[PDB]
């Protein structure tokens, strides 16, 4: 396997923090969807 998915865990956090600046703050739907996509620490 080569790095095609590690992007996703970082983007999971990157979109959580990028929401707080925009109009209306957090949208709990989009925030939970962004937060549920992740990556296992070890295999």
């Amino acid at each position: 396997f080569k790095l095609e998915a590690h992007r996703i865990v970082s983007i999971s956090l990157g979109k959580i923090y990028n929401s707080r600046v925009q109009r209306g703050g957090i949208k709990l739907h989009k925030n939970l969807l962004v937060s549920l996509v992740l990556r296992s620490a070890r295999q």
Binding site: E4, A5, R7, I8, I11, R23, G24, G25, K27, L28, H29, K30, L32, L33, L36, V37, L38, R39
Partner: protein
């Protein structure tokens, strides 16, 4: 198959984004929501045209949390025609407003009675004006707000819907559902509260809800996991003891986002229910829950690309669907400004182009004729058959 005819475009960059489209129960008047509070209303020419406009909401800055709440009318719903004046429920992210759109009834009366500024007395201030101001007869439709609902939704509002018995209407935010009486706007009955005490464990988001069209007690609310729960207020006052749960190899990272159902609508007959998840339109007979009666695919090629759409914002798009008045057919939007009609009779699907890049998020279907209305982002289309 239905030979849909290309719509005439009558309406039409950030405030003008049609966040909802809705025909009245007898579909003569069409009201479209917006992201700028301007509910542009059209009505069918008596054998559609720009009828009126009203600023349903202003940018209500919350001073307790400093949240710059937008004027985003996420739902437009009509009421039954109580009198000659039509009514519309408009809901922004935080609060609902009931509106009255009445014609100018006193047009003749205003012309039939007039005197001088001092009621026909001498030395009137505006002596000429009174001679001409007496001609006030006009055919314009006058918008007016009737009742203001309270600030009940602590979260972004996603759905409202008039009940079958015209005393109450549903309101659901991403965590809770409140039932609002139409005239009594000072209080609401919180009928559903899925909220976990600690927000740490937030798994379920109520993405959409509606009332059963013929039964005043049956309503459904979607979920982030796709499990559509059909609640029945007959069982108990609080509807946490739901009556049914509808739920269905490809278990990618994003299984938790594809399973989210952005929209749920009952058939006009209330015999079937159609739920739009991200990838598929699932049509359920209300008596069988372990699988739909028919599953429909909205876009095939997008199932594998769940990272690319997740780098982008596109994968969060809220799609919606609507039925034929006869329920024989259903229709939903797809990306690239394309929407698809899923005929349940012949199982033949025809995609249609409105005239990724552009999303047909919201659309509507006239409940008495093969007329469908489409909420393109910066355009509105009303396709005929």
């Amino acid at each position: 198959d239905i030979q849909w005819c290309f719509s005439q475009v009558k309406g039409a960059a950030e405030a003008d984004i049609i966040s909802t489209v809705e025909f009245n129960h007898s579909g003569e008047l069409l009201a479209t929501g917006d992201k700028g509070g301007r509910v542009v209303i059209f009505q069918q020419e008596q054998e559609y045209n720009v009828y009126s406009t009203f600023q349903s909401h202003e940018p209500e800055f919350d001073y307790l949390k400093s949240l710059e709440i937008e004027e985003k009318i996420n739902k437009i719903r009509w009421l039954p025609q109580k009198n000659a004046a039509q009514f519309l429920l408009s809901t922004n992210d935080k609060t609902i407003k009931l509106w009255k759109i009445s014609e100018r009834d006193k047009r003749p009366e205003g012309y039939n009675l007039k005197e001088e500024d001092g009621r026909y007395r001498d030395p009137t201030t505006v002596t000429t004006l009174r001679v001409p101001v007496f001609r006030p007869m006009d055919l314009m439709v006058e918008a007016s707000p009737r009742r203001i609902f309270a600030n009940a939704h602590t979260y972004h509002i996603n759905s409202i819907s008039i009940n079958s018995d015209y005393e109450t209407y549903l309101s659901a935010d991403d965590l809770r559902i409140n039932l609002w009486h139409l005239e009594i706007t000072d209080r609401s009955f919180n009928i559903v509260d899925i909220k976990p005490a600690n927000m740490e464990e937030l798994t379920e988001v109520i993405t959409a809800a509606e009332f059963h069209p013929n039964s005043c007690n049956t309503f459904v609310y979607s979920s982030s996991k796709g499990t559509i729960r059909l609640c029945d207020m007959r069982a108990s006052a609080l509807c946490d003891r739901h009556s049914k749960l509808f739920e269905e190899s490809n278990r990618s990272f994003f299984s938790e986002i594809i399973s989210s159902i952005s929209d749920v609508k009952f058939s006009h007959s209330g015999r079937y229910m159609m739920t739009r998840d991200y990838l598929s339109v699932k049509i359920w007979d209300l008596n069988m829950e372990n699988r739909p009666v028919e599953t429909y695919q909205v876009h095939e090629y997008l199932r594998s690309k769940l990272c690319s759409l997740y780098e982008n914002d596109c994968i969060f798009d809220k799609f919606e669907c609507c039925w034929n008045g006869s329920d024989s057919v259903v229709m939903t939007g797809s990306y690239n400004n394309f929407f698809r009609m899923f005929d349940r009779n012949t199982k033949r699907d025809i995609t249609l182009e409105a005239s990724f890049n552009k999303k047909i998020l919201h659309t509507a279907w006239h409940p008495k004729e093969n007329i469908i209305a489409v909420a393109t982002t910066n355009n509105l289309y009303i396709f005929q058959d």
